[PDB]
Design a protein around this nucleic acid. Structure first.
Ligand code: CA
Length: 314
DNA sequence: GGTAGACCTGGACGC
DNA sequence: GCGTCCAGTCTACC
């Protein structure tokens, strides 16, 4: 009863609602779609993970987003805490307004968007986002998810335990910069990315001015931010774009990887024109990015997630 | 300046 | 069952 991951049906009094139609958000299309790797559908339609240094379980009905927090007496989330959820899902942005625009200037988007509504972008923490995506290169969502889980378990603060799952906060720069972290991460199966994580943690703390440097990027321009990030080991143009888009508030950033290349070729008959190559390359990847920005506008980064999510779900 | 290759790991086909 | 195939970044070299 008071044990294990909660359910809306089982512990009614412990849940609070946030007005939010499914047309505005579909958890099943957002949480497991490569934006964040920290959410699990422990119970059907119920997703749990760490949000703002606390464990939460989220589920939804047609017009409501139901939320519960595990912090000492078990109680429903408070207005303040719920606001933490609204910020995480950037709920002040109306997705229906964005879908309408993208759909009006892109017939193919409109076709796809009819079936995959509610795909929005999570507003993530810089550190978590940086190191999660450093772990993403040349990898698949399933493996990435495990690596990040092992990373947090070995170097992140212990939060609370539900059933046999112990939740951990995301590691700090100091922890990741610690001695012999690479060796350890390597034993956890991060492969060559083990060094990238270690090397990047130290680079930020010992050469860029630390956390302040990363966080300051949220006020910088996309061009600036993307440039700064490419400095770090393991961070190329794709990883830099994912970070800008999902954690540094650069909605025009368009991450280009295998999926967006397939989409561009299959659904837009796209081809590099000013580029020198016919396939993926630093110059062509950049061009593809500009193509989507020119097509969808300032929020091209958000539009991209809709087709990406629909691509995965197929 | 703009390429070819190597690269951790493990679920996938291919045969 | 074994080998190859895949899900970006970095570097040696033209
Ligand atoms: Ca690939």
């Amino acid at each position: 009863g008071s044990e294990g991951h909660r359910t809306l049906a089982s512990t009614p009094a412990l849940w609070a609602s946030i007005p939010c139609p499914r047309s505005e958000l579909r958890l099943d299309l957002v949480l497991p779609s490569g934006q964040s790797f920290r959410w699990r559908e422990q119970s059907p339609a119920h997703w749990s993970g760490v949000l703002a240094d606390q464990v939460w379980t989220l589920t939804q009905t047609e017009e409501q987003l139901h939320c519960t927090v595990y912090r000492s007496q078990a109680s429903r989330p408070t207005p303040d805490e719920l606001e933490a959820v609204r910020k995480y899902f950037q709920l002040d942005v109306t997705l229906a307004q964005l879908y309408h625009h993208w759909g009006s200037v892109d017939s193919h988007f409109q076709e796809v968007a009819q079936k995959f509504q509610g795909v929005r972008l999570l507003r993530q923490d810089p550190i978590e986002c940086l190191f999660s995506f450093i772990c993403s290169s040349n990898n698949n969502i399933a493996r990435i998810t495990g690596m990040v889980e092992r990373l947090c378990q070995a170097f992140g603060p212990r939060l609370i335990q539900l059933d046999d799952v112990t939740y951990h906060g995301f590691p700090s720069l100091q922890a990741l910069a610690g001695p012999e972290v690479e060796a350890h991460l390597r034993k956890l199966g991060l492969g060559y990315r083990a060094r990238y994580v270690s090397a990047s943690a130290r680079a930020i703390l010992e050469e860029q001015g630390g956390l302040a440097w990363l966080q300051q990027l949220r006020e910088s321009s996309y061009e600036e931010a993307h440039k700064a990030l490419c400095i770090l080991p393991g961070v190329g143009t794709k990883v830099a774009d994912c970070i800008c888009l999902m954690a540094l508030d650069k909605p025009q950033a368009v991450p280009v990887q295998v999926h967006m290349w397939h989409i561009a070729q299959r659904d837009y008959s796209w081809h590099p024109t000013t580029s020198q190559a016919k396939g993926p390359s630093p110059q062509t990847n950049k061009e593809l990015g500009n193509f989507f920005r020119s097509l969808w506008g300032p929020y091209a980064g958000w539009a991209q997630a809709v087709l990406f999510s629909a691509d995965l779900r197929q």
